[PDB]
Structure formats: C-alpha cells, structure tokens
Amino acid sequence: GAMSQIKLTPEELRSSAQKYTAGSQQVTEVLNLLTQEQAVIDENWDGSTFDSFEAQFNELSPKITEFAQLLEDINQQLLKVADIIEQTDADIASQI
Amino acid sequence: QIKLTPEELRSSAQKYTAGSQQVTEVLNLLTQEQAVIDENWDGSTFDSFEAQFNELSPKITEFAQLLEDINQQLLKVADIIEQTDADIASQISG
C-alpha cells in the first residue's frame, strides 16, 4: 500500500507541499489585484470598448479560484501524509 | 470618455503583464512538481489530484494569455492617447 508505494520522505513531502501553498497564494494575489484593476478600468472608461475583455476575464476568473484551491488542497494532503509517515517510521523504530 | 491618463494606463498594464508572468510561473513550477509526485508515488491514489490539475491547466494558460493581451492593448491605447494629448496641446499653444 501507501508505505510501499510512496518513495518520498516526510521532509521531501513537506518541501513539495511548501511550493503548492506558495503557488496558491501567488495565484490568489494576482487574481485579487487584477480584479481590482478591472473595476478601475470599468469606472474610468465609460463605454463598452472594454466589454469583451471584461467578459473573458469574468468567465475564466472562477477557474483561477478553483486552481488556487486545488493547489492549497494538495499542500494540505501532502502535509498530513508526511505526518502519518513520520509517525509510522517512529512507531516501527520503537517496535525494534 | 477615457478618464485614465497614458501614465495611469501604463501603470495598470504593468500589473496585467506581471500577473500574466507570475501565473505562468506558478503553473510551470507546479507542473514539474506534479511530475515529481507522479514518479515517486506509485499507484493511483494521487490520480484524482492529477486529473483535476490537468483539467484546469489549459484554463490557466488561457487566463495568463488574456492578461498579457490586456496589457498589450492598454499600451497601444496609452500611445494613441499620448499622441492625441500632444496634438491638442500643440494646437492650442501654437
């Protein structure tokens, strides 16, 4: 099962995990910033010249949030798996 | 009609192109991490996360490109307006 199938150590899992959570935060930050810029552009540019970009942004936006949530979810799972493996190593060590 | 000056337009554009780049950076970086996990975790347990990531990836690419396209248009419009503002100033003064 998992103990056999997983080759990464708890430390290696945590190292990967950190990249996912940093990535998730960066994606969220870009989305929030540019969602604000879209509004600014909408309010200081009367008309409909910008309507097509607005709509593309709006359609993709929820997908970007899903991505960010996925990356954070991967972080959480990796961390929990690392903990479980680490405790396992500890228990097996004691047993002998 | 356009309340934003060319300088304000370029300031906004810079945020779009930096966002584009940053989003793509995260995608590329974690695409390699996905491969690390795939290679070092045998079996199908991580298959769902792999599928979800692979499914969203193309949208992340579309979004990054949308961001850059917006940047490029903002720059073009800023240039147009810059020339316009100069032409009008020169008209009135001259």
Numbering used by the authors:
A (entry chain A): 0 to 95
B (entry chain B): 4 to 97
Q: Which statements did the authors publish about this structure?
A:
The overall structures of the two protein complexes are similar, with both forming a four-helix bundle, in which each monomer consists of a helix-loop-helix structural motif. However, the novelty of this contribution is that by using the iterative bio-informatics approach, we can show that the WXG100 protein superfamily can be divided into three subfamilies: CFP-10-, ESAT-6- and sagEsxA-like.
The sagEsxA-like proteins form a homodimer and the structure of the sagEsxA shows that the driving force for the interdimer interactions is principally hydrophobic in nature. At the inter-dimeric interface, hydrophobic residues are prevalent in sagEsxA-like proteins although there is a pair of hydrophilic residues Y18 and Q36 within the hydrophobic core of sagEsxA. The side chains of these residues form hydrogen bonds within the hydrophobic core of the four-helix-bundle complex (inset) and the presence of these hydrogen bond pairs between Y18 and Q36 is indicative of the anti-parallel homodimer arrangement found in the sagEsxA subfamily of WXG100 proteins. As a result, this conserved pair of mutations can be seen as a fingerprint of anti-parallel homodimeric WXG100 proteins. Therefore, both the CFP-10 and sagEsxA loops are considerably more flexible, which is reflected by the presence of different conformations in each of the copies of the asymmetric units. The CFP-10 subfamily is structurally more closely related to the sagEsxA than to the ESAT-6 subfamily. Interestingly, the sagEsxA FRET signal could only be detected after extensive heat treatment. This result shows that the homodimer is stable, and a FRET pair homodimer can only be reconstituted after heat dissociation.
